[PDB]
Amino acid sequence: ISQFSEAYNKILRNSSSASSCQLVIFVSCLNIDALCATKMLSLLFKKQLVQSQIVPIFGYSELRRHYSQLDDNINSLLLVGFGGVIDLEAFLEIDPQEQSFRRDIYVLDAHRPWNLDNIFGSQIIQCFDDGTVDDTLGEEKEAYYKLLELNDLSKRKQRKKQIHEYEGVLEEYYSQGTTVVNSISAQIYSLLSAIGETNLSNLWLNILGTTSLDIAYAQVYNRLYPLLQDEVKRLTPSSRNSVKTPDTLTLNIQPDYYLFLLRHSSLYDSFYYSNYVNAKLSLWNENGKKRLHKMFARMGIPLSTAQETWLYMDHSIKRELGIIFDKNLDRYGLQDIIRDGFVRTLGYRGSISASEFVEALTALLEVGNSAQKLTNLRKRWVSNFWLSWDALDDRKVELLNRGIQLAQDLQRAIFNTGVAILEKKLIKHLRIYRLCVLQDGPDLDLYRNPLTLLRLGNTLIECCAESEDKQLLPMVLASIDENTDTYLVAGLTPRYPRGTKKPILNNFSMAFQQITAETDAKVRIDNFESSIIEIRREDLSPFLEKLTLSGLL
Amino acid sequence: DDDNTEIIKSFKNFILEFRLDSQFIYRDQLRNNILVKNYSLTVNMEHLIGYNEDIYKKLSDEPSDIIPLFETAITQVAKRISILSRNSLPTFQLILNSNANQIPLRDLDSEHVSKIVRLSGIIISTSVLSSRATYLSIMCRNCRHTTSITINNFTVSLPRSCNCGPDPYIIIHESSKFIDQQFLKLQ
């Protein structure tokens, strides 16, 4: 509810001291956006050389272990991606200490709607709600100034009728789907441009941030291109090349493709594993696989030349890469492939597509790495976080490729198993919504991570619906290996075929909390996201039955 | 042959200006190779194709007409590094190993002939060494023409012109520079 620059000067005044400082910025959690945000944030701190702690939090339940344990001198705290949904004032408590409260916890979140207790009643925040939903948002505005603090019998009856009158519309709010408005990174950059830093790798961090989520919607991002492209116009390494030159040597616009790993993998394998194209061409089917080859017969690209790594393909095919696709792809309905994208060239190393980089980092997060076992695993993910954090750095590229050799493999897993599902037609159309469960599969170790099931769930909800009449219906998935029937189950959102009228607001967040409040059968919201929960095989089936009814949508 | 000048200038500009941040990998590959008396260079194609797409476009086109202009191109560089003046320095062999796409043995049938092919197999037996030639002098049986033939590679017959004929040219083995050869045979 504040100016970004002024919130900045506040976090400046409470910061620098002897001993320095102290602030812990919480990077959270598994979302690439977090990295994108906190890296340019951390670089900004290093600019004024302000000491910082930075914590890799996984579990939402895990945050309590930290904040309740170690705090001493820390008068100014910062947090990322948490608290937009569940309020930490009740969750942490707080317990006001010393107006002009000593500690300011900044909470940065893209999630909506905000918790009601957060924005109004200033204690721990210093909210980041600005500027996306301001709004009004008159529904939260009347939620308090009316409620607080609230012949005489008719005035009591009138008063109470008014109270429930506000409580109904208030109940409409805060019970709703969790949907990201704008990427937190973008706003950190809006905060950053007011201070005056135009830095190139910074901007690349923004591009990374925005393009973190294009796998899932945009939704506003379709109109974020002005806010990026203009900035790309606010700077330039040289008016003209001047090949290369070995330095600056920076990012530029190119006809990029939702196509998967075009530059770091072989072309044919790049269609065959791509996510958008899995769908339209029915590639899980042997009968459709051929249709790809017909694409190549249309392009005049040899099959043998399609099998070869993209660095080494002939030059003629490169110069025709932006034409041939226009000549052909239009006929297959694949006409939405070509985006205007961002590509940063490091020169003699190669170039990297904005999206593919994100595929590298995601790749890093799950691989390349009774409560003791889950804690130890979540711990392994915590360590792995930094292995992924390092790849963002420019000076070490040598491990970034270790991401990509993984990012390929994962797909080779994901695709494979994905097909293993469609052969058995495991989709349960049900009535109100679509649902699935993986009872058996190869290498569930890869599927342990929330984000792995976010991407498999994504290629699957993308595959089932082209569309593909009728009625985009949200999907459900489940997997188990070890940790005694943890059976991780993540919520999902429907995918429109590039024509998106409504955000549609994932409802699993609410539907799960209704069940935690009913019989709560081995239901665990331990994962940071409201869409993803844990379950046991003993209680999963009654849970599934209680999921089927009553349907909130 | 101004074109060969144009190609070799690009190869020199590829060796002297190449930067992996910030050491020059090749240029030092060179020095550290002449000192141990290795007289070789190993190019990494990915860096090559990174540098110019063009020279790799031609190098995968007609390799055997180009690669020796790359050899002479690099040895003309070691002249400016390993020594200085104002010998003898053999033209270095380049060894290029790169990822590309593995092409199995069964799948080699014509069509890629004279195009660089990475592959994989278990060597059966190695043939006993024998020398080919690199630089050999030649005198005529009659007019006694003294000809220094620089043989390259890239089989090659001797020139018949300074009766005389048909092929009056003798190999002088007292001045002739020789290299070695192996013949692997791989299953």
Side-chain angles (χ1 to χ4, degrees), chain A residues 1-156 158-553, chain B:
Chain A
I1 50 185
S2 39
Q3 285 307 107
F4 289 144
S5 37
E6 279 316 299
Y8 181 65
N9 311 140
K10 185 176 86 177
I11 190 77
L12 282 188
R13 294 167 70 185
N14 301 340
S15 286
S16 42
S17 278
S19 295
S20 297
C21 165
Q22 195 54 253
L23 62 315
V24 184
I25 62 100
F26 297 113
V27 190
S28 69
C29 183
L30 188 25
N31 291 336
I32 292 206
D33 188 42
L35 298 176
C36 296
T38 59
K39 177 57 186 182
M40 41 177 297
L41 198 46
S42 181
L43 184 140
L44 186 146
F45 283 165
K46 291 181 47 190
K47 172 166 186 177
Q48 286 153 349
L49 295 171
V50 186
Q51 294 284 348
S52 70
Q53 182 76 257
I54 294 174
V55 175
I57 309 99
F58 180 67
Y60 176 86
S61 168
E62 185 67 25
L63 183 144
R64 178 188 295 179
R65 181 177 181 170
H66 289 304
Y67 180 84
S68 185
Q69 185 176 2
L70 275 66
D71 299 302
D72 294 321
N73 55 342
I74 294 96
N75 47 1
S76 56
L77 177 301
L78 188 147
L79 189 150
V80 164
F82 283 170
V85 179
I86 307 95
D87 176 19
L88 276 57
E89 185 167 27
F91 185 82
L92 294 182
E93 68 166 337
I94 300 93
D95 186 37
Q97 297 152 336
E98 191 251 356
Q99 210 189 346
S100 192
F101 290 97
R102 54 177 200 86
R103 183 184 299 175
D104 299 320
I105 304 94
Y106 295 94
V107 158
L108 313 168
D109 192 355
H111 299 54
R112 303 297 182 275
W114 287 93
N115 199 313
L116 293 156
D117 293 351
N118 286 339
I119 305 178
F120 298 82
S122 178
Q123 170 86 46
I124 61 171
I125 54 93
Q126 209 41 75
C127 44
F128 191 59
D129 183 32
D130 201 53
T132 52
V133 184
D134 175 62
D135 193 11
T136 50
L137 188 22
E139 185 184 358
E140 185 172 359
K141 192 187 176 178
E142 64 171 346
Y144 275 147
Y145 299 81
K146 304 294 177 304
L147 202 276
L148 276 312
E149 67 288 343
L150 68 74
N151 296 337
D152 286 346
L153 298 175
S154 185
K155 304 295 296 180
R156 181 189 178 264
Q158 184 60 233
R159 182 182 58 193
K160 298 304 181 62
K161 187 187 54 50
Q162 286 174 344
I163 293 174
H164 296 75
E165 186 64 24
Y166 302 130
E167 282 166 0
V169 191
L170 178 58
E171 184 62 26
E172 198 274 342
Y173 191 89
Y174 173 84
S175 67
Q176 208 183 331
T178 52
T179 49
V180 161
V181 177
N182 293 323
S183 301
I184 64 186
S185 192
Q187 286 93 9
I188 299 193
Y189 181 65
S190 74
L191 185 150
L192 188 147
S193 196
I195 321 168
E197 291 83 13
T198 45
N199 287 337
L200 296 161
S201 58
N202 289 337
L203 193 55
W204 178 257
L205 287 152
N206 295 311
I207 306 173
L208 295 174
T210 55
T211 313
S212 177
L213 62 80
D214 282 4
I215 304 176
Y217 52 88
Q219 180 64 258
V220 189
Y221 166 67
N222 295 125
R223 76 187 46 89
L224 262 183
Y225 289 110
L227 299 178
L228 281 174
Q229 292 178 350
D230 290 342
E231 302 283 347
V232 165
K233 277 191 302 187
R234 291 173 70 259
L235 62 80
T236 291
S238 301
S239 179
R240 191 62 62 173
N241 300 287
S242 301
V243 162
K244 295 277 296 208
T245 60
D247 291 337
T248 53
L249 177 63
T250 67
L251 62 80
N252 215 11
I253 52 100
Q254 295 176 355
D256 301 340
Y257 303 134
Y258 302 94
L259 188 147
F260 178 74
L261 284 186
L262 193 139
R263 296 158 179 278
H264 309 158
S265 61
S266 55
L267 201 53
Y268 175 82
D269 294 325
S270 295
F271 280 92
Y272 178 78
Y273 292 121
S274 284
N275 193 17
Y276 163 81
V277 160
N278 280 348
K280 183 154 292 290
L281 309 189
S282 288
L283 294 171
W284 63 97
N285 284 327
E286 306 164 353
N287 289 336
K289 177 190 299 291
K290 300 286 288 180
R291 195 175 154 92
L292 196 61
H293 305 105
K294 179 197 296 178
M295 300 176 52
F296 284 132
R298 285 294 170 95
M299 300 166 184
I301 306 175
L303 184 60
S304 300
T305 282
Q307 302 286 334
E308 145 175 23
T309 292
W310 192 85
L311 277 165
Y312 299 166
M313 295 179 72
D314 293 335
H315 188 44
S316 66
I317 295 186
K318 304 312 186 183
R319 296 181 281 107
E320 292 309 300
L321 187 64
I323 286 180
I324 290 183
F325 279 0
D326 181 65
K327 181 180 304 168
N328 289 335
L329 273 296
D330 176 62
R331 185 193 171 266
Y332 293 88
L334 288 190
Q335 178 58 84
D336 306 329
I337 294 169
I338 295 100
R339 295 176 64 186
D340 303 330
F342 285 173
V343 160
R344 168 189 182 75
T345 60
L346 208 49
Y348 307 104
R349 282 189 191 64
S351 313
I352 305 91
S353 303
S355 62
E356 298 307 339
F357 192 89
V358 173
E359 292 305 304
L361 307 186
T362 46
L364 286 179
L365 298 177
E366 47 263 35
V367 68
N369 63 332
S370 181
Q372 185 61 55
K373 309 184 54 64
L374 72 95
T375 50
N376 185 24
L377 185 149
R378 295 175 174 185
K379 194 171 66 63
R380 184 183 59 91
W381 290 347
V382 167
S383 300
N384 199 16
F385 178 102
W386 292 110
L387 190 138
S388 178
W389 168 269
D390 184 1
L392 177 63
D393 302 358
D394 307 337
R395 62 182 51 187
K396 313 179 185 56
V397 198
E398 310 174 0
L399 62 80
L400 170 60
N401 290 300
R402 186 177 182 175
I404 294 175
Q405 292 175 357
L406 288 175
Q408 303 194 161
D409 175 82
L410 288 187
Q411 287 305 346
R412 181 192 304 169
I414 294 169
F415 189 88
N416 191 22
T417 311
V419 177
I421 291 163
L422 295 173
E423 287 181 354
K424 296 184 290 294
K425 300 171 53 182
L426 301 175
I427 295 86
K428 268 67 191 179
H429 176 268
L430 305 191
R431 289 188 297 268
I432 300 175
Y433 64 96
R434 283 177 189 97
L435 189 161
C436 293
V437 42
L438 188 147
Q439 59 177 8
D440 185 71
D443 285 337
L444 280 312
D445 278 351
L446 287 179
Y447 301 126
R448 289 181 177 297
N449 192 303
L451 290 194
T452 312
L453 260 54
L454 190 55
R455 298 167 68 209
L456 165 71
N458 199 57
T459 197
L460 251 66
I461 194 150
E462 176 65 27
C463 168
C464 55
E466 271 80 4
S467 57
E468 187 72 16
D469 287 353
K470 310 184 164 313
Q471 191 53 269
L472 295 300
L473 285 179
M475 298 289 294
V476 182
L477 286 183
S479 66
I480 185 49
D481 203 346
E482 285 299 330
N483 299 85
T484 66
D485 300 343
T486 59
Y487 280 81
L488 186 137
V489 176
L492 286 164
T493 75
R495 304 301 169 188
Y496 297 77
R498 301 299 177 277
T500 300
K501 177 61 182 186
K502 291 304 169 185
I504 62 100
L505 262 76
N506 185 338
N507 301 151
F508 282 106
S509 53
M510 321 178 44
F512 291 155
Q513 289 173 342
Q514 288 308 96
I515 301 170
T516 64
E518 175 197 357
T519 50
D520 52 46
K522 297 310 172 186
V523 199
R524 300 183 166 182
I525 313 199
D526 312 314
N527 288 296
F528 60 104
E529 190 54 38
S530 61
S531 67
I532 169 178
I533 58 176
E534 294 178 344
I535 210 76
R536 304 298 299 277
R537 65 171 297 269
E538 312 171 337
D539 294 327
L540 70 71
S541 178
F543 169 83
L544 300 172
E545 296 182 337
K546 295 164 185 185
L547 181 54
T548 54
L549 55 91
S550 66
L552 271 66
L553 66 94
Chain B
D1 287 344
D2 65 332
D3 175 84
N4 297 342
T5 315
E6 293 307 303
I7 292 181
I8 284 169
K9 286 312 174 63
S10 178
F11 286 152
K12 279 187 196 154
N13 288 340
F14 164 90
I15 288 183
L16 303 189
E17 289 300 310
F18 179 70
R19 181 171 309 98
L20 275 66
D21 267 355
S22 64
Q23 75 284 26
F24 306 168
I25 303 301
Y26 286 146
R27 196 162 172 185
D28 271 27
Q29 178 61 31
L30 209 39
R31 164 170 75 101
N32 295 317
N33 270 132
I34 62 102
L35 286 186
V36 191
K37 278 160 198 172
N38 202 219
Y39 300 86
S40 178
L41 197 162
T42 63
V43 198
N44 209 357
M45 301 308 272
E46 284 90 5
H47 301 154
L48 188 147
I49 184 68
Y51 175 66
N52 197 343
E53 199 259 6
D54 187 34
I55 71 181
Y56 180 75
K57 176 59 180 181
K58 60 192 54 178
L59 186 50
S60 178
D61 210 3
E62 283 307 316
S64 309
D65 293 337
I66 296 187
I67 294 169
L69 300 168
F70 191 73
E71 281 176 25
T72 72
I74 67 97
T75 189
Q76 283 294 336
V77 171
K79 295 301 177 47
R80 292 181 295 103
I81 287 185
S82 306
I83 72 185
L84 177 299
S85 61
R86 183 179 59 180
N87 180 38
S88 53
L89 197 149
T91 294
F92 297 155
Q93 175 202 4
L94 62 80
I95 311 152
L96 55 81
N97 63 347
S98 284
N99 206 343
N101 194 20
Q102 184 180 188
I103 302 172
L105 203 55
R106 305 285 301 161
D107 268 6
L108 303 174
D109 188 272
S110 169
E111 294 284 349
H112 37 64
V113 177
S114 75
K115 288 187 185 67
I116 315 160
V117 158
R118 161 166 208 274
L119 61 100
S120 90
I122 286 183
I123 305 196
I124 305 179
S125 62
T126 63
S127 182
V128 171
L129 319 176
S130 64
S131 40
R132 287 161 67 204
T134 284
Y135 169 71
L136 46 72
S137 185
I138 274 177
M139 76 181 283
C140 186
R141 289 191 163 85
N142 309 318
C143 46
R144 191 176 289 163
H145 193 180
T146 75
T147 76
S148 52
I149 281 189
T150 55
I151 190 64
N152 287 336
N153 63 347
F154 180 23
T155 296
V156 183
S157 48
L158 276 51
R160 45 204 50 105
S161 67
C162 289
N163 293 331
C164 296
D167 55 349
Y169 293 70
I170 294 169
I171 323 168
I172 296 175
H173 307 254
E174 65 183 349
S175 65
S176 306
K177 269 194 301 303
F178 287 12
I179 66 188
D180 198 18
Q181 184 185 201
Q182 182 74 75
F183 305 88
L184 291 45
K185 201 178 294 178
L186 62 80
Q187 186 173 355

